Amino acid sequence: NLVSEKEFLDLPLVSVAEIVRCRGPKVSVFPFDGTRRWFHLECNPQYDDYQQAALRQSIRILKMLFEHGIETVISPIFSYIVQALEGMALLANDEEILSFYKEHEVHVLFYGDYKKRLPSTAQGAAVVKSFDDLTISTSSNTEHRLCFGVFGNDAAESVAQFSISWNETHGKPPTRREIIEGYYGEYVDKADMFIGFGRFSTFDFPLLSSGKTSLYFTVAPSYYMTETTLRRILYDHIYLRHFRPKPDYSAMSADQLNVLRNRYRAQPDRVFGVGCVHDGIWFAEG
Amino acid sequence: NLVSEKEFLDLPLVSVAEIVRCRGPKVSVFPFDGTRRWFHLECNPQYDDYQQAALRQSIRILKMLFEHGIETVISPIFSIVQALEGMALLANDEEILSFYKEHEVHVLFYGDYKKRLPSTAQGAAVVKSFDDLTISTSSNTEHRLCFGVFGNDAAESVAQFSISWNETHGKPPTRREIIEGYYGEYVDKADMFIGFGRFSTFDFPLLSSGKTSLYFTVAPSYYMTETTLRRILYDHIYLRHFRPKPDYSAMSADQLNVLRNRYRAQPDRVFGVGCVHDGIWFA
Ligand SMILES: [Mg+2]
Ligand SMILES: [Mg+2]
Ligand SMILES: [Mg+2]
Ligand SMILES: [Mg+2]
Structure with a gap:
């Protein structure tokens, strides 16, 4: 699929979705991060509704990912609390988002230790109940999958308990496939990519990470994300992360090898992830 | 406790090791990547031995990590005869063994190698070597070195361990018990992962966290210098959790238009999106 970035970017949406459904990413993890900074810069914190402002952007981005062909989107939403x-409740009760789930035929699931960790109060109990009801009401949807992580960072103990019960009722240990389904509600493949923000770090997609998960870190908060930016990330994942032919130094020009060698020996301390702080804000050097 | 990067880089090693032992990283994951590219560029493929050349560099780096104050280093080595x-050299080579002793390193192995390695002699040998090396260095308690062999996905390992544990205890195991079970000894979550090239991470099951500082060097692991390592530590220790934390709520209007224009002018600046030059991916 010999295609240039610019060309990929100029391609019509339905053509991108098609490529994506053929070459992946099939599963993308995308935590909406830096929302606080975003709100103060792009909104009027004096009057604007933080909740709704955020909700609107969440819908816009989730829509964009799905229209680009991405089957499953994993989104950690919680890793003061009344708000x-x-x-969280808005994700299961807001009319605009519910319309979005219906229109795009999205099956919404929740993962994490939220049943235990959420406050044992009227508000906490309602959220938990809202989650279960949403998964049930959107269960007829089969076009896309959306997994929201609430306290979904350390699955060890959850997998241990799930496994013990499973073996008890089946007479044998669950396969990796069954374990994934037990934790997320449905089987999900390993993440093909994770789109982070600021300081290089990833989180909350337990059991789904592999050496094959392409990692990206935006400079600007997640809500600044535009279609062009997503397509540049997609292009890198599809055409560059596993570019073929794979390198065969054994047959590279002596001149190309020399430049390469000089580059490494001159900048042996060039490391992406090493940043600098300006006014309390961390910025990746590059 | 207020040190610029330039100052940190000029500190005597002993002073750096004292800062690391106090502020971390305590657990560092560092897979030695891009060694074949490194070998082709820095050695004479015609006469230098790949295994030896690589082992020397591995020893050199582990030494650097441990002398800088890092207590535990997790190093994925595999995930065929060569x-x-x-692997054999890790538990047999005369110089690395002297290393484990000299720097008092306790070596442990993790992953599903005991069931994935070739069911042969040479393979059965490796397994025994691993078990013996862990035993022979069990008196050392200054540093920990965990070698990952087929240590990519612990899902089924944890399931079977938990089911057996419930049978031998009548209770499910705690997270701590599961970690001890997979790695042999309890190990805290990784504080940093030092990668290479295309941004990706791997082989340190159950120990990743949102607080794990991620780094990705441009050049193969073996080009790492003392300066490179210190720049990673500095960022981790002083910048990744810098304080006071941002207060936009009280920032200057001028500064707001700065961050604002930065983010609006360059809407698509994404570290991880690279380019391939002559078949090589560059960030
Ligand atoms: Mg993020
Ligand atoms: Mg981050
Ligand atoms: Mg690496
Ligand atoms: Mg990599």
């Missing part, structure tokens, strides 16, 4: 709980 | 020759 943290109100935001 | 692959075993390299």
Whole structure:
């Protein structure tokens, strides 16, 4: 599929979705991060509704990922709380997002230790109940999958308990496939990519990470994400992360090898991830 | 406790090791990547031995990591006959053994090698070597070195371990018990992962966290210098958790238009999106 970045970017949406459904990413993890900084810069914190402002951008981006062919999107939403709980509730009660789930035929699942960790209060109990009801009401949807992580960072103990019960009722240990399904609600393949923000770090997609998960870190908060940016990330994943023919130094020009060698020996301390702080804000050097 | 990067780079090693032992990283993951590219560029493929050349560099780096104050280093080594020759050297080579002793390193192995390695003699040998090396260095307690062999996905390992554990205890194991079970000894979550080239991470199951500082060098692992390592540590220790934390709520209007234009002018700046030059991916 000999294609240039610019060309990929100029391609019509439905053509990108098609490529994506053939070459992946099939599963993308995308935590909406830096929302606080985003709000203060792109909104009016004096009057604007933080909750709704955020919700709107979440829908816009989730829509964009799905229209580009991505089957499953994993999104950690919670890794003060009254407003943290109100935001979660909006994900299962807001009419605009519910319309979005229906229109795009999205099956919404939740993962994490939220049944235990959420406050044992009226507000906490409602959120938990809202989650279960949403998974049930959107269960007829089969076009896309959306997994929201709430306390979904350390699955060890959850997998241990799930496994013990499983073996008890089946007489044998669950396969990796069954374990994934037990934790997320449905089988999901290993993440093909994770789109982070700022400081290089990833989180909350337990059991789904592999050496094959392409990692990206945006400079600007997640809500600045545009279609062009997503397509540049997609192009890198599809055409560059596993570029073929694979390198065969054994047959590279002596001149090309020399430049390469000089580059490494001159900048042996060039490391992406090493940043600098300006006014309290961390910036990746490059 | 207020040191610029330039100052940190000029500190005596002993002072750096004292800062690391106090502020971390305590657990560092560092797979030695791009060694074949490194071998082709820095050695004479015609006469230098790949295994030896690589082992020397591996020893050199581990030494650097441990002398800088890092307590535990997790190093994924594999995930074919020559692959075993390299493993063999880890628990047999005269100089690396002297290393484990000199720097008092306790060596452990993790992953599903006991069931994935070739069901042969040479393979059965490796397994025994691993078990013996862990025993022979069990008195050392200054540093820990965990070698990952087929240590990519612990899902089924944890399931079977938990089911057996419930049978031998009548209770499910705690996270701590699961970690001890997979790695042999309890190990804290990784504080940093030092990668290479295309941004990706791997082989340190159950120990990743949002607090794990991720880094990706441009050049193969073996080009690492003391300066490179210190720049990673500095960033991790002083910048990744810098304080005071941002207060946009009280920032200057001028500064807001700065961050604002930066983010609006360059909407698509994404570290990880690279380019391939002559078949080589560059960030
Ligand atoms: Mg992020
Ligand atoms: Mg980050
Ligand atoms: Mg690496
Ligand atoms: Mg890599």
